[PDB]
Amino acid sequence: RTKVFVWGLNDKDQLGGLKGSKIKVPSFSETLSALNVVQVAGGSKSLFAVTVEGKVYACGEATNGRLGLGISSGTVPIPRQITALSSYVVKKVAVHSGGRHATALTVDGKVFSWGEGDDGKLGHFSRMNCDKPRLIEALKTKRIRDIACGSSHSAALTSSGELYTWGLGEYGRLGHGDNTTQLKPKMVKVLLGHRVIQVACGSRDAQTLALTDEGLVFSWGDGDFGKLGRGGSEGCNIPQNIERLNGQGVCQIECGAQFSLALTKSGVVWTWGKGDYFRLGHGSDVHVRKPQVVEGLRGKKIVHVAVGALHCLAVTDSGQVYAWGDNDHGQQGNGTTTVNRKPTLVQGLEGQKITRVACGSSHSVAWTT
């Protein structure tokens, strides 16, 4: 059994069957806890849950076919199974906090995509929307081990460590040396020679992050607010190493709205990028153009992290959830709508040994195993 807790914005019932629009305290989700989930993922006013059985359930706003349920207008208030994938065992669903498209990776390495089709982010050599998941034919001959989705582009990496990107080319987020939109997955040849094991994609004028099995972090794309981590604000269309993170043991990378986050094996969290509304967690709202340790979590061994648009969540090895950032919709879980300028213990989870967190655009998830 897995107990699932949700809070934050719920205007389009993206919390899966709760009453109220601003859930300011983590609330037990009976619909999601009954599913026995291995992963929850949050998009733009949307929520996806992958179960141990390998099925995918979705809820929230259904505009642009972002839920993959065959519809494209209303909202689905109860987690509904993505029946298009019922003949596969899904391992992970990739979606950005401000995303209207998503991908699913099966245990045998197949990738499906669905949702908004703009700029070819779905990867079907086209710009068509997909109300239901569709197999990405271009990735069929490759054993895909991980996936990631931004708001306007997507990524996948092979078992051998090669990274593919596709979608909107503007501001260099795909990393192929130009700014051309790719309607199909294209291998980032610059990163040949590194075994990429993780990738993260941003939103709007987006950055992209990549992590290698040697602990090296690379970044490329839009440079606004220093989210590339190399100072200043200049963008680039070729992967560049973030030298500050070398030797730190980075094991997880994420991209919020205009900011980046890294977590190391020893439990340290680094953030950098746009500082507005305190999404970085350093106590101020100024920008941070090179990665900086979140001092409010020092001494706490963080084992998992999640980023929303303007908020983050971090889980300690002892099951405590810390939150920082904006709170217009209660997504901080401090019982109010007041911003957490620094990492703050979340309410209502004492006795629940949380192991994993997830975030949508303005909502938050925590669950146990």
């Binding site: 914005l9 601003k22 303007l310 303005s362």
Partner: peptide, 10 residues
């Protein structure tokens, strides 16, 4: 105003 802030539609 932040371009990445949701609006509570109800």
């Amino acid at each position: 105003f932040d371009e990445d802030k949701d609006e509570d539609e109800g």
